């Protein structure tokens, strides 16, 4: 319908959002696929109501409220991620979660306030460009976390992981829009499989095809401070 196609064109965006809320690729992709299946199986109705992307995210949230699969206040990490990775406003965030825009702002504020109360953890960065590594590290330290080290190659990473085993890996392998550095991602995911692994990339859609083993957390390049904080804070929740 070009519309029904526009909804399937936002499926990788939902895979990213679902992977972050569940902390796993397998679980995130499964829920993201079942959301599109149900939207397709529905005959018309409730459309035109929303823009194609927002409607798919809204369909996700309707099921998210029934069942997931406490410490953090519910609805807050959801609104924060929608704000950080998708750039949604409080008004679009209110439409997706079916709350007033002022209430959606309260979700983001409470999320940002609990991030200030988070317990410290250890992060290792894999990064070649020095100036990026030092800016990323400065953010992680202002967050209250400790930077184990900066491995300039994925060869170095196994060394620094032995000396001090972090609880989180930040990786930027200077990937491109090619499919060449596909085995490099699989290697780093397999090495640190028991750790949450965030990948910095300028082409997130390439890592959002539920075909290969892919990360559950992503930092879009060029990065924004807020989206780096959201990624690390979300990943340093499934850390041990």
Numbering used by the authors: 3 to 71, 89 to 259
What do the authors of the reporting publication say about this deposited model?
This response works using a so-called “partner-switching” mechanism, whereby HK activity—and subsequent phosphorylation of a downstream PhyR regulator —controls the activity of a transcriptional inhibitor known as NepR. Stress activates an HWE/HisKA2 HK, phosphorylating the PhyR and promoting sequestration of NepR away from σEcfG, allowing transcription of stress-responsive genes to occur. Exploring downstream effects of RT-HK, we identified two homologs of PhyR in the genome, RT-PhyR and RT-PhyR′.
RT-PhyR and RT-PhyR′ were solved as a crystallographic trimer and a tetramer, respectively. Unsurprisingly, no electron density was present for the disordered loop in RT-PhyR′. Aligning the two PhyR paralog structures shows a reasonably high degree of overall similarity (2.7 Å Cα RMSD), with a notable major shift in the position of the loop connecting the β3 strand (immediately following the phosphoacceptor aspartate) and subsequent α10 helix (α3 in standard REC nomenclature). Adding other PhyR structures into the alignment (left), it is evident that RT-PhyR′ adopts an unusual conformation not routinely seen in other REC domains. This large-scale shift in RT-PhyR′ is likely related to the unique position of a conserved Q residue (Q193), which “leans in” and diminishes the solvent accessibility of the phosphoacceptor D (D191) (right). Notably, RT-PhyR′ was phosphorylated only at the longer timepoint and without a marked illumination dependence, suggesting that it is a nonspecific partner. However, the analogous interactions seem to be inverted in RT-PhyR′, which exclusively binds RT-NepR′ when provided with both RT-NepR′ and BeF3-, suggesting a negatively cooperative function for this homolog.
